[PDB]
Amino acid sequence: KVFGRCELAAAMKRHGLDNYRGYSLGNWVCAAKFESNFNTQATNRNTDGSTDYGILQINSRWWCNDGRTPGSRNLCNIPCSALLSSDITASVNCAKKIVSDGNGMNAWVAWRNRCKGTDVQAWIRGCRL
Ligand SMILES: [Cl-]
Ligand code: NA
């Protein structure tokens, strides 16, 4: 599913992302835009053999099981395919675990390079929230 910007904002807000660990809604929408272009079905393979999955591009090295990342962990306790669903619940739940792990949203490379220190509120502007 390819989300609308406001549609996703509303979805994330409902799932308890707004201000989660201090990160305003705009940060999550920004991260999603640049990680996956709001596409739940986005996948990207990394040099190390791991794969990133879904709207927030969560990585199979630590967070989910895809059966093909030797010596990886499954800290979210889910198959990586569950991160590709039209229902963002699994991705949200897992992102909450990642952002609580000490490094905040810095775990998302696109957030750090393209959202951090920017006017992220702009990503939810005009939305009925
Ligand atoms: Cl933080
Ligand atoms: Na894994």
Side-chain angles (χ1 to χ4, degrees):
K1 171 179 199 316
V2 175
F3 278 80
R5 166 178 71 90
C6 295
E7 184 182 16
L8 174 70
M12 287 175 150
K13 192 191 182 195
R14 191 170 55 97
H15 286 92
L17 289 179
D18 179 36
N19 297 140
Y20 191 86
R21 288 282 280 174
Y23 292 90
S24 59
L25 197 61
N27 289 99
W28 299 100
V29 173
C30 186
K33 170 64 190 180
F34 298 126
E35 290 283 357
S36 79
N37 201 42
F38 302 142
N39 188 172
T40 65
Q41 299 194 76
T43 59
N44 285 294
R45 192 84 185 273
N46 305 124
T47 66
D48 65 2
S50 67
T51 303
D52 298 329
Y53 291 85
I55 208 165
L56 291 166
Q57 285 298 268
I58 283 173
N59 176 269
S60 67
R61 175 133 307 180
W62 303 99
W63 308 108
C64 61
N65 184 59
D66 63 357
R68 59 166 206 192
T69 312
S72 66
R73 304 201 208 173
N74 181 10
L75 286 173
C76 291
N77 290 172
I78 45 148
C80 291
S81 62
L83 302 168
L84 307 192
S85 172
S86 55
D87 184 324
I88 66 166
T89 297
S91 282
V92 171
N93 287 347
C94 185
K96 276 169 183 188
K97 168 154 308 249
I98 292 167
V99 74
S100 304
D101 84 352
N103 304 301
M105 281 200 77
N106 293 297
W108 284 280
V109 183
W111 179 81
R112 174 154 33 71
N113 290 338
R114 305 181 78 170
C115 301
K116 192 181 182 170
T118 70
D119 169 17
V120 291
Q121 199 280 319
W123 290 95
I124 57 173
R125 195 167 300 156
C127 304
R128 189 179 301 143
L129 304 171

